[PDB]
């Protein structure tokens, strides 16, 4: 949460001169926050998962490529 909340705060601070004053600051910050949350969701959808399968439960498993090596004496 605080990375995307502070990134929304940076993008609100760096674009405050375009505020035409037709509304209040709260709806502007609301739309900026939801747009940054959806942009972070899109960027997370492009990224691989962070905590999908544990690595200790990966060597003793079928089709392990780099966890186990075919190297015998």
């Amino acid at each position: 949460v605080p990375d995307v909340v502070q990134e929304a705060f940076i993008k609100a601070y760096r674009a405050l001169d375009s505020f035409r004053g037709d509304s209040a600051f709260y709806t502007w910050l609301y739309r900026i926050a939801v747009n940054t949350a959806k942009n972070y969701l899109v960027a997370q959808g492009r990224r691989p998962p962070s905590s999908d399968v544990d690595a200790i439960e990966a060597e003793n498993f079928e089709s392990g490529g780099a966890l186990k090596e075919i190297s015998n004496p």
Binding site: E59, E62, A66, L67, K68, E69
Partner: protein, 1312 residues
Amino acid sequence: VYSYTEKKRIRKDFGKRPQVLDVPYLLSIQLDSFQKFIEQDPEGQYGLEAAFRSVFPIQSYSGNSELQYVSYRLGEPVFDVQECQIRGVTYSAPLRVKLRLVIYEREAPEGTVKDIKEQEVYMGEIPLMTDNGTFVINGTERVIVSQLHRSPGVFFDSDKGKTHSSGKVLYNARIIPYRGSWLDFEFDPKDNLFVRIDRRRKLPATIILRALNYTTEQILDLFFEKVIFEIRDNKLQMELVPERLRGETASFDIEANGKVYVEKGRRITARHIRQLEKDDVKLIEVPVEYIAGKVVAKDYIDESTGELICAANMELSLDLLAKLSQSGHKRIETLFTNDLDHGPYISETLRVDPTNDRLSALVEIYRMMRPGEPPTREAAESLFENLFFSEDRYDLSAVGRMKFNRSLLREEIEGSGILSKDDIIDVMKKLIDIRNGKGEVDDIDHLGNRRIRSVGEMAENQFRVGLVRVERAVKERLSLGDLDTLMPQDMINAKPISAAVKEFFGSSQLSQFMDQNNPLSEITHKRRISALGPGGLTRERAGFEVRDVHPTHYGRVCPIETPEGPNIGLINSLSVYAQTNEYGFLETPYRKVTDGVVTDEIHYLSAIEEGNYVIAQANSNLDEEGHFVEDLVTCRSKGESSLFSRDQVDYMDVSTQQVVSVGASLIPFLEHDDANRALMGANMQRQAVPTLRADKPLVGTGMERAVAVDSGVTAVAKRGGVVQYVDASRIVIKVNEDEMYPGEAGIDIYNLTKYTRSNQNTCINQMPCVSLGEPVERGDVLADGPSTDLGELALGQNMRVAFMPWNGYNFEDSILVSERVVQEDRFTTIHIQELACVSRDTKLGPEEITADIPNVGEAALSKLDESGIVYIGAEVTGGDILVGKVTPKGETQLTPEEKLLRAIFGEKASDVKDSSLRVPNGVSGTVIDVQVFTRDGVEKDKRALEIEEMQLKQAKKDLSEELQILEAGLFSRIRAVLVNQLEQLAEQYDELKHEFEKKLEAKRRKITQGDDLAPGVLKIVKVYLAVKRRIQPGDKMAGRHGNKGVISKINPIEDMPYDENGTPVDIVLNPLGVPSRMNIGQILETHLGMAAKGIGDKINAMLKQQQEVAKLREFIQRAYDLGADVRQKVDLSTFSDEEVMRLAENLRKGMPIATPVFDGAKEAEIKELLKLGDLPTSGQIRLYDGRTGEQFERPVTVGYMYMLKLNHLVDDKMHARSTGSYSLVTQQPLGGKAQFGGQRFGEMEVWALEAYGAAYTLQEMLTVKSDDVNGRTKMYKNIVDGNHQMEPGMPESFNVLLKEIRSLGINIELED
């Protein structure tokens, strides 16, 4: 009367107590809960209608837009259950709900709506079940285990013992709702009252009462009494009632009406109370120091100056006494404080409360609730009214209100869902009275305080969790939506309904796949009472309270059936007659007893209604017409066994088998067994492997006819009649003319299931049991599934068992088995393993299923066809290939013999590596089925097209048979017309033909199209291996009385001990485990099996020599009319003299005898049964030696014992690895039998080697053989060269630890 499945082989029954209630449906709880979960019910009853009426209707942010709800509907399943189990898709159903979206006009409060939008919309899917309560989630069968949790309401725990290291008991009251926040009042070791909400910081309990709009004088009026002090002319006299002065010593001279009563320094007893009440005095003389120790209750304002003279919760002094006397106030009300009546707990909590107002109280409760966001009279009051009083975030149901009204001893049973202030006043008063010394506390180990949730109530919570997210999504969509743009179908989405229900039904702590190898296991796994899961305790962090059994579990929770190991008592089993209450409790049926006669009716009594009435003994001896033969009887008043009379009883037990579960009721002579032995036998009957040829048990319990019928392993006939066409695949049942439907009827088709794979790799098979022309009735069986025999459960097989030590081969508990068992094809079990090969889409080219495998021999390619898949019916050995698959050599982790060639002259990219599915080492099975799934857009080979052509031919044959029987029924109907309408029936004939062609086109579309797979794979080939395993030295076998052993060594027939008749014994057990492990019932079962084998031998000798039916009928009549007053009471003269020969053919192998659990047969019945045959009365027969051939002194006991085969075969645990795969993050061998991994040297084994010497043995085991990168290769080179010489080197996992410590801010270095 007797049905036809009992006329083939009637079981001899014992016992004397007659039953009144039949055996109910054993799978009725989960089926009733799932029928309650999905049913159309008005007025807001159970099911999905309550969740559809709680959330809907939804409105926007005052935008005059509403989304209404009308009804719902369920769609048809798109596949059969067998095709759903094969393909691996979920067994779901569409959820068609009709909605209504109305929107009001702008700038109008009563705008009449002219734009109504009613449209059926589709949201998510719900998983359905079969006729046995088995869900199909992903291929396999997973059943949901019911959870046993605490009932919603109020509780009074006693924090005694070593709580807070003070040596003083405590009292805390907790309010537990079904969904919402938790309230907890608790006491100190001191006298201060405090409260806590969801385990937060400690804050006083009076501040939430002041936040409920209450003043301090109302607090001291509600909680404490009122002592009246009047201002007389002198001495400030006081009113008195003599009851309040109990236990208090008089510090003055109590005198009234000019007469002294109590001297200064005298305590008042009850006779003094009676003497002071007989004089009827009210006003006494009290000194001025008594009021100076008391506290004034209410605030008294002055009338002269208009100020406050004495603040609340403040003790009085002499100057304040002079002020209140000079002001002119006569009435002064104080409090009453005494350690025996009302302890000081409200005044100290009021004086420790720093805020005496409401706004600062809201500020403090907002500070303790949410640290941060400082409000100004907005968020604190809204949070206080939203945390406890809103119906959305507080969900006290009807059972919670019922428990709250029952534990508080009130009259009403219903109410509202939200809480109230007066309930908080009453529970604080109940805490005050339970501290004061009236009433008792409620134990947490009470079944009346524990509620069980089924699959429907657990699924409705996840449906509501998804529905509130749907409500939030449609709120955010309706907040900006305008008018007349869209039909309401994009306002809602499928997710997260289907995602949440898939997360619930697929992966949970209770959603586990069942073990499918035993119908006993299928019938006891659904009747499992688990205490783990969400909203419960963990199995590793449980105390000594939950594991022990309470005496309220008599008839509801089985005490002898619990798993030994990490969780003992946490996993409970439901009883036979235990039923689920409407609120969620467990009841037991009982026989209603009047003053003189026991009325034969049933009455369901819960656990809370147990202590009120009295329940008599189950096996009490009674006379006819409802009379007890004895005056003294054994009963229980409130959970304690006592001795009562014949007139105080009001209820009686309905049966004697209501205490044990369905798995423990099949063990004969259970009352002669220890609880540990019966507990180990009840957990070993759940793992019996079915054999190749089932055999009936000789000593049954009568419950064997219910487990095979009410389970889903057999095919029960729905409509009785005659059987026309008996085949191994299908069974044709012809419906009789009386039970036939009056329109569009016909015959029934029962399709049996063939050899397929189960969850525990057990080959389940169904075989027919009826012949051509045989008539059947309603409820009769048609086929025998796994471990069944003519509609009766049969787990193992009976064998001849002798009890003698034989050369140390039965040393501890081991079993000796002759060669006659393995020669008669008895213990051969069939196992089916699933081997799958997937061709994933990788880089530099996709993989192929071609048969041109490079660098392989022609002897290995002799099993492959022109496509590359092994045939159906070709035997394979361990190490052979099954399906060919090539690799474009883009993958990593190559062998070094290929890595050296690639380093010298490689990387051409034309060559393909041999990465194919192969048979594992050890198993030798026969390929019986090949399944090929193909993604759309991928070309197929000729064998796959042959497979789909065979499936299309089988489906065409099945649909042709269905068309033929439908046309036969329609031709019978058009013949029945002729006893403008024949045009109508010809139109129906043409419509049925067009519907058949449309169903055939739909089946062709289902067969020819492709199925969905993983993202990035081409096709999956599944090969089914069928290995046949037999008995060998190394397996595990056990009986029913909790005696287990390992088979030692196979023995020929001539080496076995044999009697004087010449018959050799097959099993030689050990009689030394009988006195220590106290299971004496196995000898009684052996004697009963010997008597049954004697009757069977007499029957076979009477049959083999040709004999008339009169003598056989007389012998069966003499065997069935034994003088024991049994409940069978059969006669052989009522038979039709044709099925008596079938009865003799079914009884020529033995005599099945039934013996009840606690009403079993006495020893005299077994003695007269042995006296009926030519067997000796003592039961011990002389046996000769096998090798030497002499005569054994002290002749042993022989007979027949029912013994099972465990799922612990020696060809599944044996493993040996020289050199195999190694992990990369740590240079260490792997572990397991699937992968080539060795065992693990434990941490205690290193200390065991350190207890010895062996520095070189411990150094070679840890470094050379396990950890060294350049040490094991040199050791392998030196061993084969003839040089036993190792090198120490350095371990690699220590370097991993060094890099892990060096990755932090701590430096570590190896010096010189």
